[PDB]
Amino acid sequence: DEVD
Amino acid sequence: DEVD
Amino acid sequence: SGISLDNSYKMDYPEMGLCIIINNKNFHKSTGMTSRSGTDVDAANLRETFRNLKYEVRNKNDLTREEIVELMRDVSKEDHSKRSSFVCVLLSHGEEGIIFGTNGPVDLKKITNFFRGDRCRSLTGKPKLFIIQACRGTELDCGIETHKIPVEADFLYAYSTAPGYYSWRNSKDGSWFIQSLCAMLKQYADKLEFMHILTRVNRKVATEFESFSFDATFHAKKQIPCINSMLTKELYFYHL
Amino acid sequence: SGISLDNSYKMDYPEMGLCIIINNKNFHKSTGMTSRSGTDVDAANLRETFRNLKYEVRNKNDLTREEIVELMRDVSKEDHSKRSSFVCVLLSHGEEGIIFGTNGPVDLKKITNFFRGDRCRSLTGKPKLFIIQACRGTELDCGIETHKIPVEADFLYAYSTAPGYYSWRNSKDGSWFIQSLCAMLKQYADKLEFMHILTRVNRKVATEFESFSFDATFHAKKQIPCINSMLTKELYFYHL
Ligand code: NA
Ligand code: NA
């Protein structure tokens, strides 16, 4: 999980 | 007619 | 039992919830804000409309930015356990993100945050509705001839006008947005899901109103409201 | 004839319309923006999902801020007379109001304005849909355990996340918002009005995802999308  |  | 489904908010708690109407008509001279003629029409119609839906309506008039915050902090600390939803109607001046108390502005976020799912537990997972008749900027529409749930979930912002735009109010008839909102609840609350009612309100405001002014800048302008839904289920004002 | 009603957008034009997917995965080194791993999953699923709805899909990948604007200006000057609606999906980085091309930002307004009812006549009164998977700020949701029509009318903004908040993407599974959007069209496009589909998408994203990170700051966070509807009728992806 990563943030854009 | 008026703006708020 | 039988096959069950859970696509709708539970609206058969003993009480529908509170409807807070904040009607701000007269502003401290030192702010330079004109009186919002006609907003009493809006206030009375809302009161009557939400009464018919079985909401516990509390009108407040000419609140200062401190009394607005304190009212909301107080209302968010009440026990909404027996209540289905929460409605809050703000009738006033504003800018994007901001509503004016009689003596200066309040950020919408400061108000709504009081009811974040983690700060107002007895309303967690219940729909919290915020109806805002206020300006959102200074633009004018010329038209064209034809951790388990987010804290921010379960809010619905019913905006009178689009982002950045002026909101229109008539000094005899009330604000376009609110006239249409109340008309469409009268006529459709016992038939339509809320989102479909607001869409009707959008179409009414967009189709049946055109400003009239002696000032070229302000004449023949239009408005379209903005629905901001963070809801997670459908919302009907009746139960089975 | 018989009694008629006009609460729905006409969706039986010969063609459903264009679906523009702008997938921006790799960014110029000089901007300091990391590659958006997994967005190809998002792009392929959208393409397939909107194909099933009978949209003319055009994927574009790694567009610069000039090519984004030029693409949109070109698409807004095509003749949409025979088309029912218009969809545009933006997969990328961003801030509130802003999406990044591979080399720097574009304001959403500059893009959407191309399609204002007065600037794109062949789409006037048809629904224009904008689906935005991008950040809208830097906040993190910790959750809680349980003149005839406005130029701005007929737009629907389907925002991946709430205003001011981060948007979440999984490098193997795709972005939470888009996985859920495509799932819910698959399953409900032939049964639900669009607003009720997005509400399902909201509930899915809000209920079935929780971020996982080795970094305390980013672990166990949540997301709720934002529907901004300026639509004036209900929108079904089928016709009778
Ligand atoms: Na109004
Ligand atoms: Na997302």
Side-chain angles (χ1 to χ4, degrees), chain A:
Chain A
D1 293 328
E2 287 159 56
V3 297
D4 255 10

Side-chain angles (χ1 to χ4, degrees), chain C residues 165-183:
Chain C
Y165 276 87
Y166 279 123
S167 204
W168 280 98
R169 170 176 42 85
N170 181 285
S171 26
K172 149 175 56 183
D173 304 327
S175 72
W176 303 359
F177 176 61
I178 304 305
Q179 296 178 51
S180 320
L181 180 59
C182 305

Side-chain angles (χ1 to χ4, degrees), chain C residues 1-146 148-239:
Chain C
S1 76
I3 306 172
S4 60
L5 254 297
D6 55 341
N7 312 124
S8 74
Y9 284 114
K10 182 179 179 55
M11 302 298 288
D12 51 356
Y13 290 84
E15 321 181 345
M16 286 292 286
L18 306 183
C19 187
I20 309 292
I21 299 167
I22 296 189
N23 184 30
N24 269 359
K25 193 226 271 187
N26 312 111
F27 292 81
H28 285 198
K29 43 136 54 191
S30 326
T31 63
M33 313 199 77
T34 40
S35 264
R36 293 180 57 255
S37 289
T39 187
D40 283 343
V41 188
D42 287 343
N45 193 214
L46 290 152
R47 182 181 166 84
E48 179 60 31
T49 294
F50 280 90
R51 183 181 84 78
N52 287 329
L53 303 174
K54 307 301 165 221
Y55 279 94
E56 193 209 315
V57 181
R58 300 177 206 174
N59 300 75
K60 297 298 293 188
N61 298 332
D62 291 335
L63 297 189
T64 72
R65 72 167 162 185
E66 295 78 357
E67 296 166 317
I68 288 183
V69 158
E70 184 216 341
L71 183 68
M72 290 299 91
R73 177 201 318 266
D74 287 8
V75 162
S76 75
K77 298 193 173 186
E78 312 189 8
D79 181 26
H80 299 262
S81 297
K82 281 175 185 165
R83 293 164 186 168
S84 288
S85 62
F86 173 74
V87 170
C88 170
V89 194
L90 306 162
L91 299 189
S92 186
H93 292 293
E95 305 180 10
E96 176 74 47
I98 305 166
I99 191 78
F100 284 96
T102 59
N103 72 328
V106 187
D107 288 21
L108 300 176
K109 270 287 196 173
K110 173 165 280 187
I111 291 161
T112 66
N113 284 340
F114 283 125
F115 307 85
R116 291 157 46 124
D118 66 327
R119 300 182 184 179
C120 170
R121 302 302 322 277
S122 67
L123 279 168
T124 307
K126 310 187 176 153
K128 297 155 277 261
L129 322 183
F130 284 95
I131 306 174
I132 307 159
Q133 166 68 34
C135 211
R136 303 181 79 205
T138 35
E139 274 195 289
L140 287 148
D141 196 306
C142 71
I144 184 50
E145 190 107 355
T146 46
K148 278 286 166 291
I149 59 162
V151 298
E152 299 285 350
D154 295 324
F155 291 70
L156 184 288
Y157 303 91
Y159 282 112
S160 88
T161 181
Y165 276 87
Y166 279 123
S167 204
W168 280 98
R169 170 176 42 85
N170 181 285
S171 26
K172 149 175 56 183
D173 304 327
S175 72
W176 303 359
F177 176 61
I178 304 305
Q179 296 178 51
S180 320
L181 180 59
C182 305
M184 305 291 83
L185 292 158
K186 235 112 60 176
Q187 169 176 14
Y188 291 120
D190 53 333
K191 324 182 196 182
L192 305 187
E193 196 275 341
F194 193 26
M195 292 308 287
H196 290 342
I197 307 190
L198 291 174
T199 299
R200 302 273 174 129
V201 176
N202 284 8
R203 179 172 76 251
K204 195 192 180 66
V205 172
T207 55
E208 295 166 12
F209 297 77
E210 184 192 297
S211 79
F212 181 80
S213 165
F214 298 142
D215 188 325
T217 301
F218 292 86
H219 164 82
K221 307 303 188 184
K222 305 288 291 172
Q223 177 178 329
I224 181 70
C226 196
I227 309 160
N228 275 40
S229 185
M230 281 75 143
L231 295 182
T232 48
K233 314 177 178 200
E234 292 156 44
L235 169 38
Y236 300 87
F237 291 112
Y238 56 90
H239 73 259

